[PDB]
Design a protein around this ligand. Structure first.
Ligand code: ZN
Lengths: 198, 710, 48, 116
RNA sequence: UGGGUGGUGGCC
């Protein structure tokens, strides 16, 4: 059985390293200097190093030539224990969600309507904007007349208002966000959040 | 530094090539006068830069040729004219400063007094001065004796060929103290020492008589030849070249895992790291072996007592680094960084198949800000790795009194660390006669480690030794490679900048010819010093920078080459164009550095020490111009200093830089911090002739007062 | 570390993580360690 | 095989029949080679959506699939070279499962993930 | 906005 070793890789660029290695193997398999490595495994949450399965350090040192992702690991590689080969392949894991990016990060939001398109769903957000008074932010209720006085990119349709940032509002923001862009499990709004919305 | 060093550094950098590939070769640079801008390029006055907290710097333009070539015969050797690289700070009153060649009237109209010496940079509106640091001389063989370790003697020899990117790498050839007494070597980048004979056989000298021919130049003295037997019987296992290379490579910094790896690594480290100064050509064993043999021969000579040890305090063995070498040292790294950055920027585009624009590649910020930061802070190195670099190289100019300013512009520095109980580096060596002020020195924790030049002292700037080599080859010198080893003994060796180059048979005629040509100043410039030793048949020639030399008169037989005609022409030097340069041309005065001073006969004064009496020496070869010329700037204002106790002169030199006075003529314009000026300064009623050239009678500091001692 | 060994339990990254924790703890109460890197902040200076 | 190698890193999906990692378009443009003779999965986007789901964790690259223990443990030892997923959660449609059972294929999901 | 670093200098 070929052994498994750790090779230093750029943090976040491990996913394309396996693709590059596969392309290199395909390119060199018809040539006089093929890549003699058996397999390369990249875990889901392990960042900074990639597992490579081969027989001797010479084979990997020859094969990882020209790979800038493994430049730090080009010269020296560590030995992974034999008992960890099976452990390498182990992976573990009207509601409320919280956004992952943007200015609304880590905010309690309540689903308004579910679109059957399986792409985006509308949430109830607290407007985290300064009403175009500072920019040329804590959670607070939307003031329609304030932003109507401030002018700028603003549209009024009664209580349905449209303002800067492609945000749809009513009475409370009603904007659709990607299902992968929100976290549907692990929110649990508290009683203070309920009032705000053993 | 501006005219030569910058062009040499930019041209000797290897090109960068990176399937498509490119060249990007640089060529002749251009420079312009300092200019500030958005706005039209307008000349920047030094005074304006001083008030507005600007930086008196000049832009740098280089010519670049970009030749990118790919598969299918697609090469485009495009070139770009005058691409901006960075701003180089300019030193006042230089050739490239706006205050150059201007009349005193123009200077006054520009609010810059004509008395300002210049020689300082302006960084963010502060006047910075580059203190000259001293270092032990390079490319020379020195033998010392550390009697506190396993070695009884050590033949240290630095080596730097010419402005190498890697700093100087040392070579050690020592003797074990303890049979015993084994001669060994300490190669660079080798973690362990190695005996000498293995080193020689690694060069390929498998034969045994060749090694001893290289080391021993005369096979008639048994005590000399027997001393190699201890470290010759220690080496009879290794005979072939490959086994020697493997023996070396087994102890490398990163030893190979295969015999081929060890052999190639050791061969490369010998061909590149060891002794770059003798030559890094395709092959240099024929002279590297001779240089190692010379080191070993010197070590044996020291051991036998036929030649005394070298002195570290003697400034014939020291060099001074002025603004030139230090700026070049910074510029090497600040250009390597720029090359790395443009290479990275091109790489980030060629891999993705996209074309790169060279204008966006060049980061003027790195070079400009690196030079500015190093000048401003004095940490003489890169910002992130300054812990391995010197500090305090650049200090704020001390503009309190004129004498203080002058002294601060001519200040030396010993980089020996303070808080050291050693007194040898602090004592006043005999060699500091006419080169360094015997009196002026701080009395704090840095006593003896800070020095100031004498008044006549001059620092050599350096010159290429190619004409010297051409003249020697044209002359009757026999080159080193095509010489018979048996002929070494009955002849004199010839050195140039420490590089052994050939042998000569007649030393006296060669020395006379060199002296005559230098005095005529036709091929050998006046900066070159020729030293001939007689106890050991050697002739040494130096043309590098940093040597310290002073002018002296010439005595032919018992009279002076200076005659009434020269004085008469000098007295009319505002009518006649006859100047000091014309005096040097006629071979009347001759600059003499310390090593040449070692062998001259000096007369203190002609009208006294040259008359006919009971012959003391009667073989004078030079004469001092005036004995009082050996004092520094501050100690030359003391009246009757030869009548005072020695520490009093030092204290006066210390306190002569804290007396108030008119520190500069145009003091009402400068917005200086902590400016002191006296209402009614006066010139001394009793002066010395030396303070006429310090302009003391124009910017005095003090008042004549009726003093009663009661 | 306590959210990594909580779920991942990779049994290899845990060793490196506890090594880094040990190094940081040691540097917190002593910065001059033989054969160890200097704990420094991104300003060119080691920490006190 | 270059066609097995994904053309990008966008909306990758893992096969529930051989754990082969291909993009959503690759499952349509090129098709799953290890199951093309089984499902005829190439040629329609809807059945591509039904066959594979974008929810997966980890990527595995067998450079020598027939000389690796990871391939044996992931039940992809005899399968063709390509990028492989570690653990994928999902169930094949009942009609597809019955068709595969009638075509001499054993229903073995690649779900080795730990459910807390 | 304070901390840090370096340099110069005074008295022993
Ligand atoms: Zn499949």
């Amino acid at each position: 059985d070929p052994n498994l070793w750790t090779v230093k890789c750029k943090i976040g660029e491990e996913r394309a390293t396996a693709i590059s290695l596969m392309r290199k193997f395909i390119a060199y398999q018809f040539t006089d200097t093929p890549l003699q490595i058996k397999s390369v495994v990249a875990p889901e949450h392990v960042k900074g190093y990639i597992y490579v399965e081969a027989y001797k350090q010479t084979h990997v040192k020859q094969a990882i030539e020209g790979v800038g992702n493994l430049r730090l690991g080009y010269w020296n590689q560590q030995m992974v224990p034999i008992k960890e080969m099976t452990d390498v392949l182990k992976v573990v894991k009207k509601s409320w969600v919280r956004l992952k990016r943007g200015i609304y990060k880590d905010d309690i939001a309540q689903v308004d309507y579910v679109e059957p398109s399986q792409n985006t769903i509308s949430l109830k957000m607290i407007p985290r904007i300064d009403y175009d008074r500072i920019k040329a932010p804590p959670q607070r209720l939307f003031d329609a007349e304030k932003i109507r006085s401030l002018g700028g990119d603003v549209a009024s349709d009664g209580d349905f208002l449209i303002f800067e940032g492609n945000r749809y509002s009513r009475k409370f923001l009603f904007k659709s966000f990607a299902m992968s862009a929100v976290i549907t499990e692990g929110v649990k709004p508290t009683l203070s959040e309920l009032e705000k919305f053993r | 530094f501006i005219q030569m060093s910058v062009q040499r550094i930019v041209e000797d950098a290897p090109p960068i090539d990176l399937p498509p590939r490119y060249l990007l070769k640089f060529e002749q640079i251009y420079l312009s006068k300092p200019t500030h801008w958005d706005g039209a390029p307008s000349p920047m006055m030094p005074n304006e830069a001083r008030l507005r907290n600007l930086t008196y710097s000049a832009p740098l333009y280089v010519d670049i040729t970009k030749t990118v070539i790919k598969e299918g015969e697609e090469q485009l050797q495009t070139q770009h004219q005058k691409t901006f690289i960075g701003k180089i700070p300019i030193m006042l009153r230089s050739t490239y400063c706006l205050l150059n060649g201007l009349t005193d009237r123009d200077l006054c109209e520009l609010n810059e007094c004509p008395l300002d010496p210049g020689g300082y940079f302006i960084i963010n509106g502060s006047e910075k001065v580059l203190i000259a640091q001293e270092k032990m001389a390079t490319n020379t063989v020195y033998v010392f004796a550390k009697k506190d370790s396993k070695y009884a003697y050590t033949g240290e020899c630095r080596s730097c060929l010419e402005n190498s990117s890697r700093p100087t790498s040392t070579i050690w050839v020592s003797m074990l103290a303890r049979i015993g007494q084994r001669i060994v070597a300490t190669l660079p980048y080798i973690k362990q020492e190695v005996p000498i004979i293995i080193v020689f056989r690694a060069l390929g000298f498998v034969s045994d008589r060749d090694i001893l021919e290289h080391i021993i130049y005369d096979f008639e003295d048994p005590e000399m030849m027997e001393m190699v037997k201890p470290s010759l019987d220690e080496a009879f296992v290794i005979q072939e070249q490959n086994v020697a290379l493997n023996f070396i490579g087994s102890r490398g910094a990163k030893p190979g895992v295969t015999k081929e790896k060890r052999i190639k690594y050791a061969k490369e480290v010998l061909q590149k790291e060891m002794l770059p100064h003798v030559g890094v050509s395709d092959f240099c064993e024929t002279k590297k072996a001779y240089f190692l043999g010379y080191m070993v021969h010197r070590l044996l000579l020291a051991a036998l007592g036929r030649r005394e040890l070298d002195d570290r305090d003697h400034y014939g063995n020291k060099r001074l680094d002025l603004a030139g070498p230090l700026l070049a040292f910074l510029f090497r790294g600040m250009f390597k960084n720029l090359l790395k950055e443009v290479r990275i920027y091109a790489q980030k585009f060629i891999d993705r198949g996209k074309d790169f624009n060279l204008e966006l590649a060049i980061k003027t910020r790195i070079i400009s800000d690196g030079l500015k930061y190093s000048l401003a802070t004095g940490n003489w190195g890169d910002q992130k790795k300054a812990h391995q670099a010197r500090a305090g190289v650049s200090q704020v100019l001390n503009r309190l009194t004129f004498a203080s300013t002058l002294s601060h512009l001519r200040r030396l520095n010993s980089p020996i660390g303070r808080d050291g109980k050693l007194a040898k580096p602090r004592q006043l060596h005999n060699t500091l006669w006419g080169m360094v002020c015997p009196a002026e020195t701080p009395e704090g924790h840095a006593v003896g480690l800070v020095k100031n030049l004498a008044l006549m002292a001059y620092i050599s700037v350096g010159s290429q030794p190619s004409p010297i080599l051409e003249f020697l080859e044209e002359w009757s010198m026999e080159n080193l490679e095509e010489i018979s080893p048996a002929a070494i003994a009955d002849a004199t060796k010839i050195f140039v900048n420490g590089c052994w180059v050939g042998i000569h048979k007649d030393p006296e005629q060669l020395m006379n010819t060199l002296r005559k040509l230098r005095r005529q100043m036709d091929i050998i410039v006046s900066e070159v010093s020729m030293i001939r030793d007689i106890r050991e048949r050697e002739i040494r020639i130096y043309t590098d920078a940093g040597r310290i030399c002073r002018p002296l008169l010439i005595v032919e037989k018992q009279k002076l080459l200076l005659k009434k005609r020269h004085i008469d022409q000098l007295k009319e030097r505002e009518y006649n164009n006859y100047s000091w340069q014309d005096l040097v041309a006629s071979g009347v005065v001759e600059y003499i550095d310390t090593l040449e001073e070692e062998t001259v006969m000096l007369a203190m004064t002609p009208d006294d020490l040259q008359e006919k009496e009971v012959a003391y020496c009667s073989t004078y070869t030079h004469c001092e111009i005036h004995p009082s010329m050996i004092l520094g700037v501050c100690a030359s204002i003391i009246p009757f200093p030869d009548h005072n106790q020695s520490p009093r002169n030092t204290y006066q030199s210390a306190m002569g830089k804290q007396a108030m006075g008119v520190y500069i003529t145009n003091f009402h314009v400068r917005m200086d911090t902590l400016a002191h000026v006296l209402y009614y300064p006066q010139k001394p009623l009793v002066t010395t002739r030396s303070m006429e050239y310090l302009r003391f009678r124009e910017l005095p500091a003090g008042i004549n007062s009726i003093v009663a001692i009661a | 570390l306590r959210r990594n060994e909580q779920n991942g339990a990779a049994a290899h990254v845990i060793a490196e993580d506890v090594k880094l924790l040990q190094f940081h703890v040691a540097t917190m109460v002593d910065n001059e360690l033989p054969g160890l890197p200097r704990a420094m902040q991104k300003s060119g200076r080691p920490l006190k | 095989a270059l066609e097995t190698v994904p053309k990008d890193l966008r909306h990758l999906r893992a096969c529930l029949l051989c754990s082969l990692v291909k993009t959503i378009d690759q499952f349509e443009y090129d098709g799953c080679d290890n199951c093309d003779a089984y499902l005829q999965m190439k040629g329609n986007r809807e059945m591509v959506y039904d066959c594979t789901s974008s929810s997966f964790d980890g990527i595995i690259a067998m450079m020598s699939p027939e000389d690796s223990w990871v391939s044996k443990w992931q039940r992809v030892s005899n399968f063709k070279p390509g990028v492989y997923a570690v653990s994928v959660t999902g169930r094949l449609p009942q009609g597809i499962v019955r068709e595969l059972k009638s075509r001499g294929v054993a229903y073995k999901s690649r779900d080795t993930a730990i459910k807390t």
